[PDB]
Amino acid sequence: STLVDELESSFEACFASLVSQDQEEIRTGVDQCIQKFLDIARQTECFFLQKRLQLSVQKPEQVIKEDVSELRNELQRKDALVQKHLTKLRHWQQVLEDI
Amino acid sequence: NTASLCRIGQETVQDIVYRTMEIFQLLRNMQLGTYQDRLTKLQDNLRQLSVLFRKLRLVYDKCNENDPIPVEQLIPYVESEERREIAEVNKKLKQKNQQLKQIMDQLRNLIWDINAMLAMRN
Amino acid sequence: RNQQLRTLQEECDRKLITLRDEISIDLYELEEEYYSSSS
Amino acid sequence: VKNQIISQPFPSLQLSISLCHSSNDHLYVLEHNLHLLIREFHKQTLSSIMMPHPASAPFGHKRMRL
């Protein structure tokens, strides 16, 4: 129940051999803990993707809003890059003028 | 909104696994002042990971609050002002990308000319 | 005369090489931004 | 022809080298490299590589001695 909590429990189970009071015991325990951990991680990602798919088919204006936001960040990032580059160009023109 | 909350929730699970991998690498390297520095890095990583778990439970509850259509009905087998906003920003960064291409071409040509002229001086 | 002209040539070439390296780093940033643009 | 050399390196391409004498599209890189090429061609004759460090050794390039 509530895949978050299974993720938390499995993550705490990854450390159970260290926090208490040779090789093959460690190996099989590590393999089983890490495999259950990654399996519940993939199930959580699958849940988020299914919910995003249902939103993208039912309420498509939200997707367009996120695209608007990402294109605006692309614009601002491009202008920041060109401004830094332009300041470096003007500094190099002032350097190369002085030979 | 919520269809970006799903993206953030995916990114949290992608970050948790990567952060556990970095934790296990820190525990791999720790050899019995840099002792204390590795202690601080370990405790800070564990703090950020607990923050990520709390954020993940928040995002799970938010997306699970806000389904009438079951999946596998959503795949296509064979047999309004926001659109104008999209077209506006698309035209805007079309022009921005073409100007960036001109800047990039002139930088490429200047680098190539510098290397050719300096290669021939020897 | 020869030694003075050699020193001027070496100053010009050091300036050009440093210019090329800085321009190359800027070109790397611009290439990443332009090619990874969504459009 | 008189002061103009025309070559066709690639079939769609035409390269033209012309000596413009003023007597009172241009690529600078090839002109600059032309000057440096003829400068190296001069300096090959006046090189210190022709000098034989062994006094008895006659003359000529160093690797041709080697």
Side-chain angles (χ1 to χ4, degrees):
Chain A
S1 279
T2 73
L3 279 73
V4 185
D5 300 331
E6 292 197 0
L7 189 52
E8 294 166 330
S9 85
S10 66
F11 164 72
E12 295 186 356
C14 303
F15 285 129
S17 65
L18 295 193
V19 289
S20 310
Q21 290 88 352
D22 261 345
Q23 264 64 30
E24 310 316 298
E25 206 278 310
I26 296 167
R27 205 202 305 287
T28 65
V30 162
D31 297 342
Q32 293 155 34
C33 290
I34 291 309
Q35 278 318 296
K36 194 198 267 164
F37 179 53
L38 289 169
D39 199 329
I40 301 171
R42 288 159 179 163
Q43 291 195 26
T44 318
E45 271 183 20
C46 163
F47 158 69
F48 282 132
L49 281 157
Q50 267 153 345
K51 185 62 193 194
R52 189 189 177 92
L53 180 55
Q54 273 175 327
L55 294 184
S56 175
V57 70
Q58 290 171 5
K59 269 82 71 176
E61 53 268 23
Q62 275 157 306
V63 180
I64 296 158
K65 279 183 178 185
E66 301 139 21
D67 299 320
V68 157
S69 71
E70 291 315 308
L71 296 184
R72 281 168 181 179
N73 306 350
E74 281 209 26
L75 284 172
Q76 298 177 356
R77 174 147 41 70
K78 277 165 208 291
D79 302 4
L81 253 184
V82 176
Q83 267 213 324
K84 294 177 52 184
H85 183 224
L86 178 60
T87 55
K88 201 178 304 314
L89 290 193
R90 281 173 176 152
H91 161 242
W92 271 106
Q93 269 188 307
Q94 274 155 34
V95 171
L96 282 183
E97 199 269 329
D98 293 333
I99 304 303
Chain B
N1 201 355
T2 316
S4 200
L5 279 196
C6 285
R7 175 69 62 85
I8 302 158
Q10 212 182 299
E11 288 171 344
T12 47
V13 193
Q14 289 179 37
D15 273 305
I16 277 171
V17 180
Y18 175 64
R19 204 152 294 271
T20 50
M21 197 265 277
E22 277 171 328
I23 280 178
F24 275 115
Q25 274 207 13
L26 283 181
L27 300 187
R28 187 177 55 186
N29 295 315
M30 271 166 100
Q31 291 290 108
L32 268 296
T34 60
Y35 284 8
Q36 305 165 350
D37 204 328
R38 291 167 210 156
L39 262 294
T40 59
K41 288 165 66 76
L42 175 70
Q43 295 160 263
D44 183 36
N45 284 24
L46 284 156
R47 283 175 213 136
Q48 292 148 329
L49 193 143
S50 44
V51 182
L52 277 178
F53 266 115
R54 294 178 196 140
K55 184 205 262 194
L56 193 135
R57 205 198 310 269
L58 280 182
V59 172
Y60 186 88
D61 295 333
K62 287 194 199 168
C63 64
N64 210 358
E65 270 191 340
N66 202 356
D67 265 332
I69 316 180
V71 295
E72 316 164 11
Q73 300 171 357
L74 310 168
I75 315 163
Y77 302 99
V78 282
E79 288 192 293
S80 190
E81 269 198 27
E82 317 184 18
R83 306 182 218 124
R84 315 174 182 194
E85 178 66 79
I86 283 293
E88 190 264 323
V89 190
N90 261 12
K91 204 51 89 192
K92 181 69 175 177
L93 62 93
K94 250 191 212 173
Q95 298 176 124
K96 287 295 197 194
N97 263 6
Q98 291 150 59
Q99 294 162 353
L100 195 47
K101 197 223 292 180
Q102 286 159 34
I103 298 154
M104 196 178 70
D105 287 329
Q106 291 173 16
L107 283 195
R108 273 197 201 125
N109 282 268
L110 175 57
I111 278 168
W112 291 340
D113 296 342
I114 281 179
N115 288 280
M117 288 181 312
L118 289 178
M120 259 326 289
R121 65 185 168 88
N122 318 272
Chain C
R1 179 80 265 174
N2 273 345
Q3 186 260 324
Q4 182 184 338
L5 291 172
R6 278 175 193 147
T7 47
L8 190 45
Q9 167 184 349
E10 282 322 291
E11 168 182 28
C12 292
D13 294 17
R14 282 192 293 104
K15 293 314 165 189
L16 266 178
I17 278 176
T18 52
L19 174 75
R20 152 169 83 82
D21 277 16
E22 296 208 358
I23 283 181
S24 177
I25 297 176
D26 299 351
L27 178 70
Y28 197 73
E29 297 161 348
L30 296 199
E31 280 181 349
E32 267 155 345
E33 180 47 58
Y34 167 68
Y35 283 139
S36 65
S37 91
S38 83
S39 166
Chain D
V1 192
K2 42 169 83 165
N3 265 15
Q4 191 156 5
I5 304 177
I6 292 166
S7 290
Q8 186 178 1
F10 287 157
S12 88
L13 193 75
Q14 184 165 284
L15 179 68
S16 68
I17 308 178
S18 43
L19 166 68
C20 292
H21 203 303
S22 287
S23 50
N24 290 322
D25 50 349
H26 168 53
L27 317 176
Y28 176 64
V29 189
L30 298 180
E31 163 187 338
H32 170 273
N33 286 357
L34 269 171
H35 284 241
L36 292 188
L37 275 168
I38 208 61
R39 187 68 259 166
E40 293 179 350
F41 171 70
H42 302 329
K43 289 198 282 191
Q44 273 185 14
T45 81
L46 209 69
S47 48
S48 64
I49 318 180
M50 307 308 189
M51 304 297 90
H53 285 106
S56 282
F59 260 138
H61 200 263
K62 265 172 183 183
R63 258 83 48 84
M64 282 320 286
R65 295 204 196 92
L66 270 175

